[PDB]
Amino acid sequence: MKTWPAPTAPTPVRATVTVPGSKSQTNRALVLAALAAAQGRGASTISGALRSRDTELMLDALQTLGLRVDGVGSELTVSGRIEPGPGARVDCGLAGTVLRFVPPLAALGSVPVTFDGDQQARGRPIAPLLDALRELGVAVDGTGLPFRVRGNGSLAGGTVAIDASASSQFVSGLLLSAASFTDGLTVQHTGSSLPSAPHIAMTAAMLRQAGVDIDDSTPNRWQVRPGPVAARRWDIEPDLTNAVAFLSAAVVSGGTVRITGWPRVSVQPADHILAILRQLNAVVIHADSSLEVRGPTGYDGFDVDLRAVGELTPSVAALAALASPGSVSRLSGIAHLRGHETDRLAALSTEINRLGGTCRETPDGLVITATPLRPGIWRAYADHRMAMAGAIIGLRVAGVEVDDIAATTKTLPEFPRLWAEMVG
Ligand SMILES: O=C(O)C1=C[C@@H](OP(=O)(O)O)[C@@H](O)[C@H](O)C1
């Protein structure tokens, strides 16, 4: 494969960028639309849906379950029934959301569904969710990929305790399908260190939009009452996490980047994002239905807690590597990143240090000392966000090339074109 040379920014980046839809929101809306259709409520349309590998894997997974998903652009319509064919096999790719959200849904059918994924997915956490499904009476063969859920046409539900410290998606996946369980579900996360609170909250918010009653008033416990899932039209927001990659260009170059269609009230962790950019002394404003970020003339080291927003880690680590020389930054709260698309702590450390940097992995994150970088080959590890972090680095370091820019298809297939258009 040819490398992708990361363009440099010898002068401030100035651009207006449109990012496509949220992966997290698109994939929840697909699941909820599938539940509504399966319950007999008719077809649902998702407007502004992301089209990426993760959402294609999700729509394919729904079609493997017997549903129909129409649309060649950003407008997707879901209709039909859960009626999987003999030996139905869901391909999970490297999509955690398919791996974690689809097994519950499948446990609603009367036909066994097998789940497989990419080689690299087989390393990611899954066993605690499979055990929770067994406790709820679903027959599940296997403790990792490939595994088979042997649905018999209903799932009883009730109460279950789970260790979700490795992934919030274990909670979200149970919550999405719970309204269709005979007695609903009460899920209790046991212990501590539950990452990605905003994504669990996203799940709860979208459930409420579909008319599901969920009680999230006590931390680490959720109660979903049995009931209908409404067929509705979904309006998907831009993906704010991917927007950060583009906004980071403003930050490192002292430029100005605007993101179109930025929501003033969001189901995504907008407030956490904007606060982090402001830590670096970027100026952030809402104007003309867009978000504008003006980078500072320079920035020093920062300490940032990423427990709630761990998917920002690659971009944030790139920012830390590009702080003023000798700056020390500490990224914390992110032990769970060892279980992501790749072990992102290990991968970021390797790649930064290969460029001459100083990144030390810690028990819960990274300590990054900004030092002069040099040319090299930034490896993506089949991880969209590793690829985009190398692009950020390359704005400020000539001769950086990403091995596999196409890893960005996971959530942002047009990244190369959008990035080129931004840098001009
Ligand atoms: O539910 C979701 O849509 C996601 C939740 C988070 O997972 P973890 O809680 O496993 O980190 C996030 O990192 C992921 O990219 C998307």
CATH number of the domain encompassing residue 258:
3.65.10.10
Closest by CA to 120, choosing from 414, 352, 407, is 407
Integer CA distances (angstroms), 331 to 278, 366, 380, 386, 423, in order? 16, 5, 20, 16, 28
Q: Which atom of ligand 1 is nearest to the CA of 241?
A: 15
197 CA distance to ligand 1 centroid (A)? Answer: 9
Rounded to an integer, what distance in angstroms lies between the CA atom of residue 79 and that of residue 297? 52
410 known ligand binder: yes
Q: Whose CA is nearest to atom 8 of ligand 1?
A: 167
What residues are annotated to the active site?
A: 311
Q: Could you tell me if 205 and 346 lie in one domain? A: no
In sequence order, what DSSP letters do the residues of 136-184 get, joined into one string?
TT-EEE-SSSSEEEE--S----EEEEE--TT-THHHHHHHHHHTTSTT-
Alpha-carbon radius of gyration of the chain: 21
307 CA distance to ligand 1 centroid (A)? Answer: 11
What is the three-class DSSP state of 50? coil
347 CA distance to ligand 1 centroid (A)? Answer: 18
Q: Is the Cβ atom of 26 under 6 angstroms away from ligand 1? A: no
Q: Whose CA is nearest to atom 11 of ligand 1?
A: 167
Contact 231, 36 (CB under 8 A): yes
Contact 350, 356 (CB under 8 A): no
Q: Could you count the other beta carbons within 10 Å of the beta carbon of residue 10?
A: 9
Q: Could you tell me if 151 and 49 lie in one domain? A: yes
> Which of 196, 242, 313, 340 for mutating ligand 1's site (highest number of atoms within 8 Å of CB)?
196
Rounded to an integer, what distance in angstroms lies between the CA atom of residue 212 and that of residue 206? 9
Closest by CA to 396, choosing from 13, 10, 14, 4, is 10
Closest by CA to 76, choosing from 47, 40, 101, 37, is 47
Rounded to an integer, what distance in angstroms lies between the CA atom of residue 330 and that of residue 303? 5
Q: Could you tell me if 185 and 295 lie in one domain? A: no
Q: Which atom of ligand 1 is nearest to the CA of 23?
A: 3
End-to-end, the C-alpha distance of the chain in Å comes to 25
DSSP H helices in 210-312: 240-253, 270-279
Q: Whose CA is nearest to atom 12 of ligand 1?
A: 311
Q: Who contacts 288 (Cβ-Cβ below 8 Å, separation ≥6)?
A: none
Q: Is the Cβ atom of 310 under 6 angstroms away from ligand 1? A: yes
373 CA distance to ligand 1 centroid (A)? Answer: 31
Q: Could you tell me if 215 and 285 lie in one domain? A: no
DSSP H helices in 181-239: 197-209
Q: Is the Cβ atom of 172 under 6 angstroms away from ligand 1? A: yes
What are all long-range contacts of 103-106, with beta carbons under 8 Å and residues at least 24 apart? 103/129, 103/130, 103/133, 103/140, 103/147, 103/149, 103/173, 104/133, 104/155, 104/173, 104/174, 104/176, 104/177, 104/178, 105/31, 105/34, 105/35, 105/65, 105/176, 105/177, 106/65, 106/82, 106/149, 106/151
Q: Could you tell me if 149 and 7 lie in one domain? A: no
In DSSP terms, 79 is beta-bridged to 68
Q: Could you tell me if 251 and 377 lie in one domain? A: yes
195 CA distance to ligand 1 centroid (A)? Answer: 9
Q: Could you tell me if 219 and 263 lie in one domain? A: no
313 CA distance to ligand 1 centroid (A)? Answer: 12
Q: Who contacts 92 (Cβ-Cβ below 8 Å, separation ≥6)?
A: 57, 61, 98, 99, 102, 115, 116, 117, 118, 121, 145
Q: Which atom of ligand 1 is nearest to the CA of 172?
A: 1
Contact 250, 244 (CB under 8 A): no
Q: Single out the residue in 187, 210, 237 at which a domain terminates.
A: 237
Domain containing 383 equals: 1-22+238-424
How is residue 337 written in tokens? 């990143």
Rounded to an integer, what distance in angstroms lies between the CA atom of residue 130 and that of residue 138? 9
Rounded to an integer, what distance in angstroms lies between the CA atom of residue 66 and that of residue 360? 47
In DSSP terms, 4 is beta-bridged to 402
Q: Could you count the other beta carbons within 10 Å of the beta carbon of residue 184?
A: 19
Contact 374, 232 (CB under 8 A): no
Number of domains in the chain: 2
Q: Is the Cβ atom of 195 under 6 angstroms away from ligand 1? A: yes
Q: Single out the residue in 237, 253, 287 at which a domain terminates.
A: 237
Q: At what angle do helices 240-253 and 415-423 cross, to 10 degrees?
A: 30
Q: Could you tell me if 290 and 251 lie in one domain? A: yes
Q: Could you tell me if 266 and 188 lie in one domain? A: no
Q: Whose CA is nearest to atom 13 of ligand 1?
A: 311
301 known ligand binder: no
Q: Could you count the other beta carbons within 10 Å of the beta carbon of residue 1?
A: 7
Q: Is the Cβ atom of 25 under 6 angstroms away from ligand 1? A: no
Q: Could you tell me if 285 and 386 lie in one domain? A: yes
Closest by CA to 326, choosing from 289, 351, 300, is 300
Q: Could you count the other beta carbons within 10 Å of the beta carbon of residue 289?
A: 10
Q: Is the Cβ atom of 196 under 6 angstroms away from ligand 1? A: yes
Looking at residue 339, the DSSP 8-state letter turns out to be G
Q: Is the Cβ atom of 351 under 6 angstroms away from ligand 1? A: no
Rounded to an integer, what distance in angstroms lies between the CA atom of residue 50 and that of residue 411? 8
385 known ligand binder: yes
In DSSP terms, 14 is beta-bridged to 256
Angle at 113 between CA 104 and CA 101, to 5 degrees: 25
> Which of 22, 31, 169 for mutating ligand 1's site (highest number of atoms within 8 Å of CB)?
169
196 known ligand binder: yes
Q: Is the Cβ atom of 24 under 6 angstroms away from ligand 1? A: yes
Q: Single out the residue in 185, 206, 237 at which a domain terminates.
A: 237
194 CA distance to ligand 1 centroid (A)? Answer: 11
What is the three-class DSSP state of 6? coil
Q: Could you tell me if 190 and 251 lie in one domain? A: no
How is residue 194 written in tokens? 């539950």
How is residue 171 written in tokens? 């909670």
How is residue 176 written in tokens? 């999405």
Q: Could you tell me if 150 and 227 lie in one domain? A: yes
Sort 384 into a burial class: Cβ within 10 Å, 0-12 / 13-18 / 19+. buried
> Which of 22, 23, 24 for mutating ligand 1's site (highest number of atoms within 8 Å of CB)?
24
Q: Is the Cβ atom of 180 under 6 angstroms away from ligand 1? A: no
